Paper text:
The neuronal RhoGEF Kalirin, a central regulator of cytoskeletal dynamics, contains a Sec14 domain (KalbSec14) followed by multiple spectrin-like repeats and catalytic domains. The N-terminal CRAL_TRIO domain of Kalirin is followed by nine SRs and a variable number of RhoGEF (consisting of DH and PH domains), SH3 and protein kinase domains. Kal7, the major isoform expressed in the adult brain, supports the formation and function of excitatory synapses. KalbSec14 adopts a closed conformation, sealing off the canonical ligand entry site, and instead employs a surface groove to bind a limited set of lysophospholipids.
We obtained diffraction-quality crystals of KalbSec14, a construct consisting of the Ex1B front peptide (residues 1–25), the putative CRAL-TRIO domain (residues 26–182) and a part of the predicted A-helix (residues 183–192) of the first SR. The X-ray crystal structure of KalbSec14 was determined at 1.89-Å resolution by single-wavelength anomalous dispersion using a selenomethionine derivative and refined to an R factor of 19.5% and an Rfree value of 21.8%. The asymmetric unit contains eight nearly identical protein monomers, with an overall root mean square deviation (rmsd) of 0.8 Å for 175 Cα atoms. The central β sheet is composed of five strands (S1–S5), with S1 the only antiparallel strand, and is flanked by six α helices (H1–H6) and a 310 helix (H7) on one side and by two α helices, H8 and H9, on the other. An N-terminal 10-amino-acid extension (residues 18–27) upstream of the H1 helix projects ~18 Å away from the αβα core, confirming the notion that the Sec14 domain of Kalirin lacks the CRAL_TRIO_N domain found in many stand-alone Sec14 proteins. As such, the interaction of the C-terminal H9 helix, which is part of the first SR, with the central αβα fold buries 441 Å2 of solvent-accessible surface area. Unexpectedly, KalbSec14 has only several small, discontinuous hydrophobic pockets (~100 Å3 each) in the center of its αβα fold, none of which is large enough to accommodate even a single phospholipid molecule. Moreover, the 310 helix H7, along with an extended loop, is positioned across any potential openings into these internal pockets, mimicking the closed conformation of the so-called mobile gate as often observed for holo-forms of other Sec14 proteins. Nevertheless, an elongated groove is present on the surface of KalbSec14, directly above the S2 and S3 strands. Our NMR CSP data and mutagenesis studies demonstrate that the residues lining a distinct surface groove of the Kalirin Sec14 domain are responsible for its interaction with selected detergents and LPC lipids.
Residue numbers in the entry: 19 to 65, 68 to 133, 146 to 192
Amino acid sequence: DAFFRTGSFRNDGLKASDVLPILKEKVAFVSGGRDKRGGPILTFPARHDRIRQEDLRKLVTYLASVPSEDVCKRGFTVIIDMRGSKWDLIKPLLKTLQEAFPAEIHVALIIKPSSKFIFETSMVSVEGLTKLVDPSQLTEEFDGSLDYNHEEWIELRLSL
């Protein structure tokens, strides 16, 4: 406590440059898409290289700060694509969000290939997503029409 910083990254003023390697890996992204309530969408697309827990905590802390304060106030819709994956590879993402995500999670929607978290979780089909999110607000992976270029987004964030 005299040399090393420990605990939450909430007040560390993380920038895209602080999380650049994991941003490039596209473990998670904030497309700009909004759910039907007006809340922001945080996406974890289909992943096998093990990631460092601290890198994931920094990533979700940074991504929580991406939407405007008013949009964030409605809480996030988290979309996790589990198609071609397993529960043992999804549960650690939910645990890290519960421990490190500095904003409210309204609901975590898991695309089916249970509910012991502080936020609501729902096992849904890629079509069941459209009940809570308009397809114009969903990216390509979920048969949506929202244009989102992750590499371009990173370059614009680095210019902030």
